[PDB]
């Protein structure tokens, strides 16, 4: 009934989201809500490299156009955040890319 | 022993409609031997018109009685049937079969032919697309069709591919009804729920081979996601 | 006249089972003279059994028959899924002859819950001034269902002809299609068309219906 | 019989409402209870636990709806998990401050 | 007219069996009357055994013949039965009835009584508790048992009760088995998975009510989630 | 010695039809002097028709006898489900009589797939010198059922007794419960236990088994 852009949004750890024996690891969450077609492809990019491993993504489940949700989590280490780098999740949309750029400098 | 059928595939009703059954490989001189006429509406049974034994003797059924005329023609071996007073409701298939003897009835049976008495001229079919409306239960699997109307006489074959010219097996032909002097059918295709929601093609095309025209009209697929 | 009756019209069978084909007469018969053919849909029906008592040329030994007067029945040893088709019977004393109804044999299969959908007519449909609403049944058995209209909780009558497929060769279902066929001007004075769908392996009804404009 | 652990996730630093998640993973057995706090206060509306998913481990998400003025206002929000008796407690807060 | 079995509920092998046929309401007077004994086995068919007429007839089954000895007393209105060289197989009810004329034979049936046969002697039943070891396949519902072994005579009545002194409805009675002189039986009851994963209560009671001990156990769950 | 064997065992019917029951005698009966008894389990059995002719006081008209010599059949017009019980035919001309096998009638049901649990031997039965291996079988049908244990690739004969339930009254199924008996001694000598058990109504066998020490 209607077609709706995704929606890109990531989800980083807070300063004290770093534990376990060193080196420290957290996850990165990337989230698309309320877009359709309900197929989606997720990938993440560190410092203009792709990353073909240390990722999971969950299949996507339903949340009146119809909805959908995608979750996607990729394993990081604490030295890699603290080098500044940037983390960028890409979408795939009916041929269309959005790119969401996320730094933990203030 | 065989026997061929001919005649006029359309005919118009209150007109003269005559039928000529072909057999070789024998005569009608010996006794026992006759020749007789059996028609099966669509979703009937048989009907019995008339039987011709030997010595021109022939039998009419009183239901039909001053309606059939029987006439034989030992030159050219093939009996003649007319027929007068066309009903639409009369449309039906006409076979012939040979009796050898007296205990053995219609043991060898020819092809037959259709014969449609309809009002109506044998105009080109007229395609329709099929949107399916079907919301909130995508279930298994989910299907399309594609509607083949104003067609005369009935005789189509539907095949269907995709946008890539590719092969798809449906098998699901519904029998034609007669609906207002013209005959309706509508035919579906089963297809995969993951190949729809898939590929970019968007829609394919419906064929359809009837001797009145060779056109061609898709439906744009509605797209599950 | 003599009126041939048969019973029941549809029955299901078994491979391997057992058939028995019932014929009755309105009257006596003159010398039993009476005969048995075999149907199938597409070509041309053949001989069996010709007086009820003697098989013809090119007809396995496993077709018998027996009974005289007004009664006769027909048994078949080793059903085989070739055999699965329409069966009349018919006398030849007569003069003119008459030909029965007829009976079919359908091959027993389990319950199966039915697929339903309805298309709403096109667009371009609705500019030729008739509009075709249609109510698909697939892989349902047995044979016998129905199938009512209901828009706006008003039930249609007179006004649908029906049409059903054959047996499937592999699968052994059924289907059949529902067309509703109402004028352009009363199309637009009504909102929702459903078809009603009831069968044997559905605890309740399921009933689907769509809003005009939304599709 | 091992603790589950309790992770927090904040929103960047650079910008996005929002969403709190919360995540217990390598835990046994399969029940859990996720809440959320607000400045210590308890949580009656804003928020849905995600049925529990299989990764033997389970994981459990769970979702909770804030404001961007609520969350730069320096509000203290807790995760709060009970597990075999045990109760664990989580706080975040802006990293930038 | 009634009839009414009495005797020893237990007896040793290799002893003698004394049985009585209490009945009231006729006399073996009139010709045709007569009483006979039949057993059945458990799992078996009726067995005869002997048959007295009037006038101090009695007749022997040849199978048996010099084992068995029929003796009636008027006075007691009531038939003695001897039986000697008591076997582990012959264990059966034995039941009397009373023949009314030469065809109407055993047309009123009393009750009986079973005389079990077993060289152990009256013990207290023992419980067992049964830990479910399903894995990789919880299935609908989950089951627990209780195996109640070691007792005689066969006559125990299962009931399932939660922690909280609830009722269950498990209805799910084996029969006996003689196994090594004793008699052996189990008991199960089925269970929702989503009590097993809910409230705290780890086990439930199994409760037997046998006429040697009022013992009851409890069968702790494996728990599966 | 008369010998009385009735075929078949067991036998399954439907409620309102009609049952036949077969009665076989090694040899003539004088005067036709041959009754019918009805058993119940738990109850004591009940007289119905005497001389194979004439019925008995508090006896319906249902039950019908025919047949004279060596050859007894039972027709039972009207099947009621408090009828499924086990029928005995005996002749009271031979002086001393002789009983039959009897025959068991069970209510006609769909096949049902049946639940295979196993339970290993508790601790404290261990401590007793005996350990009882459990296989239960619940909600299938028909009766007949092959359960075979398979230990350590052996095949286990001579020592398995196995007990079967009568049919449920609300569900029109069966059970049965079979148990595995060993010395404490070979239980320590074997590590994986299991039961195979075979159904019409599936299309491979299911097997079952444990680990020991796991449990
Ligand atoms: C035409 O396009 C369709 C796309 O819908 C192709 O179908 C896909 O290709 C495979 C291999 O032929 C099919 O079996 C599947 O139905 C489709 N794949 C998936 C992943 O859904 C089709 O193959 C194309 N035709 C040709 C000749 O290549
Ligand atoms: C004893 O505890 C059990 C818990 O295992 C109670 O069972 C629950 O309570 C309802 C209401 O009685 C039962 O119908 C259900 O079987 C259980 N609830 C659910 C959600 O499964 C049981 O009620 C308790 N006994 C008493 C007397 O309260």
């Known amino acids: 009934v209607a077609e709706m852009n995704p929606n890109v949004n990531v989800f980083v750890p807070p300063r004290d989201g770093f534990s376990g024996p060193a080196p420290r690891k957290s996850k990165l969450i990337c989230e698309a809500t309320n877009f359709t077609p309900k197929p989606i492809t997720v990938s993440w990019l560190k410092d203009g490299k792709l990353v073909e491993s240390g990722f999971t993504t969950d299949p996507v489940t339903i949340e009146t156009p119809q909805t959908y949700k995608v979750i996607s989590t990729l394993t990081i280490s604490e030295i890699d955040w603290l080098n500044l780098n940037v983390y960028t999740c890409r979408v795939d949309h009916r041929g269309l890319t959005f790119l969401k750029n996320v730094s933990s400098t203030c | 022993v065989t026997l061929k059928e001919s005649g006029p595939t359309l005919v118009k009703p209150t007109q003269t409609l005559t039928l000529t059954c072909?057999?070789?490989?024998?005569?009608?001189?010996?006794?026992?031997?006759?020749?007789?006429?059996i028609r099966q509406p669509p979703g009937k049974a048989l009907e019995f018109l008339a039987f011709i034994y030997w010595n021109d003797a022939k039998r009419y059924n009183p239901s039909l009685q001053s309606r059939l005329t029987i006439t034989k023609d030992a030159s050219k071996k093939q009996v003649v049937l007319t027929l007068t007073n066309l009903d639409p409701v009369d449309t039906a298939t006409y076979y012939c079969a040979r009796t050898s003897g007296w205990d053995i009835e219609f043991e060898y049976w020819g092809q037959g032919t259709l014969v449609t008495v309809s009002s109506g001229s044998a105009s080109a079919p007229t395609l329709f697309p099929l949107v399916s409306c079907e919301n909130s239960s995508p279930s298994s699997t989910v299907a399309v069709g594609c509607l083949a109307q104003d067609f005369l006489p009935d005789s189509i074959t539907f095949s269907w591919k995709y946008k890539n010219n590719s092969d798809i097996s449906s098998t699901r032909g519904f029998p034609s009804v007669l609906r207002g002097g013209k005959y309706a059918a509508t035919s579906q295709v089963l297809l995969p729920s993951k190949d729809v929601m898939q590929g970019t093609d968007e829609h394919v095309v419906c064929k359809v081979q009837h001797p009145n025209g060779n056109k061609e009209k898709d439906v744009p697929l509605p797209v599950v996601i | 006249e003599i009126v041939l009756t048969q019973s029941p019209g549809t029955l299901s069978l078994s491979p391997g089972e057992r058939a028995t084909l019932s014929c009755?007469?309105?009257?006596?018969?003159?010398?039993?003279?009476?005969?048995?053919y075999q149907q199938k849909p597409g070509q041309a029906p053949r001989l069996?059994?010709?007086?009820?008592?003697?098989?013809?040329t090119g007809i396995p030994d496993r077709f018998s028959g027996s009974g005289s007067g007004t009664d006769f029945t027909l048994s078949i040893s080793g059903l085989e899924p070739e055999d699965f088709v329409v069966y009349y019977c018919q006398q030849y004393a007569s003069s003119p002859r008459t030909f029965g109804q007829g009976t079919k044999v359908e091959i027993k299969r389990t319950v199966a819950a039915p697929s339903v959908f309805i298309f709403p007519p096109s667009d371009e449909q609705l500019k030729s001034g008739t509009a075709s609403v249609v109510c698909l049944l697939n892989n349902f058995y047995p044979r016998e269902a129905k199938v009512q209209w209901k828009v706006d909780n008003a039930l249609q009558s007179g006004n649908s002809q029906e049409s059903v497929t054959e047996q499937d060769s592999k699968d052994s279902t059924y289907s059949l299609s529902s067309t509703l066929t109402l004028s352009k001007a009363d199309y637009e004075k009504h909102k929702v068309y459903a078809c009603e769908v009831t069968h044997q392996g559905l605890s309740s009804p399921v009933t689907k219906s769509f809003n005009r404009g939304e599709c | 019989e091992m603790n589950p652990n309790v992770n927090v996730f904040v929103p960047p630093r650079d910008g996005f409402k929002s969403k709190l998640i919360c995540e217990a993973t390598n835990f046994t057995p399969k029940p859990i209870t996720v809440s959320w706090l607000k400045d210590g206060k308890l949580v009656e509306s804003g928020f849905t636990t995600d049925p529990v998913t299989i990764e033997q481990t389970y994981k459990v998400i769970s979702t909770l709806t804030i404001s961007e003025i609520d969350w730069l206002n320096l509000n203290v929000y807790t995760c709060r998990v009970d597990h075999r008796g045990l109760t664990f407690l989580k706080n975040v807060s802006s990293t930038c401050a | 007219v009634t009839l009414k079995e009495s005797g020893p509920t237990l007896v040793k092998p290799t002893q003698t069996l004394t049985l009585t046929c209490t009945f009231s309401?006729?006399?073996?007077?009139?010709?045709?009357?007569?009483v006979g004994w039949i057993r059945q086995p458990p799992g078996k068919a009726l067995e005869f055994l002997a048959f007295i007429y009037w006038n101090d007839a009695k007749r022997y089954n040849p199978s048996l013949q010099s084992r068995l000895t029929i003796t009636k007393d008027a006075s007691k209105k009531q038939v003695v039965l001897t039986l000697t060289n008591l076997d582990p197989v012959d264990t059966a009810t034995y039941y009397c009835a009373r023949t009314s004329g030469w065809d109407i034979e055993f047309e009123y049936w009393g009750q009986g009584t079973l005389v079990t046969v077993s060289s152990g002697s009256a013990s207290a039943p023992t419980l067992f508790p049964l830990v479910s070891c399903e894995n990789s396949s919880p299935s609908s519902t989950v089951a627990v048992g209780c195996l109640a072994q070691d007792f005689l005579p066969d006559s125990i009545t299962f009931s399932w009760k939660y922690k909280n002194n609830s009722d269950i409805s498990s209805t799910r009675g084996f029969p006996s088995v003689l196994r090594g002189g004793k008699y052996a039986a189990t008991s199960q009851v089925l269970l929702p998975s989503k009590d097993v994963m809910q409230g705290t209560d780890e086990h439930v009671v199994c409760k037997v009510q046998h006429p040697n001990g009022n013992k009851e156990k409890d069968v702790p769950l494996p728990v599966v989630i | 010695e008369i010998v009385l064997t009735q075929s078949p065992g067991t036998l399954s019917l439907s409620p309102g039809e009609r049952a036949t029951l077969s009665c076989r005698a090694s040899?003539?009966?004088?005067?036709?002097?041959v009754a019918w008894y009805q058993q119940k389990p738990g109850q004591a059995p009940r007289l119905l028709i005497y001389?194979?002719?004439s019925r008995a006081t508090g006896i319906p008209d249902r039950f019908s006898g025919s047949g004279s010599g060596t050859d007894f059949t039972l027709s039972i017009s009207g099947l009621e489900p408090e009828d499924f019980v086990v029928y005995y035919c005996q002749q009271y001309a031979s002086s001393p009589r002789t009983f039959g096998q009897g025959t068991k009638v069970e209510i006609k049901r769909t096949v049902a797939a049946p639940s295979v649990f196993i339970f290993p031997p508790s601790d404290e039965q261990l401590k007793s010198g005996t350990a009882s291996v459990v296989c239960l079988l619940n909600n299938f049908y028909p009766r007949e059922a092959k359960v075979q244990w398979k230990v350590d690739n052996a095949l286990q004969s001579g020592n398995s007794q196995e007990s079967v339930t009568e049919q449920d009254s609300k569900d029109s199924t069966y059970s049965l419960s079979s148990t595995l008996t060993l010395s404490k001694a070979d239980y320590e000598k074997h590590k994986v236990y299991a039961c195979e058990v075979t159904h019409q109504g599936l299309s491979s066998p299911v097997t079952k088994s444990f680990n020991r020490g796991e449990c």
């Open positions: 309401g006729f006399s073996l007077t009139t010709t045709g009357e007569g």
């Open positions: 040899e003539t009966v004088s005067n036709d002097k």
């Open positions: 001389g194979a002719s």
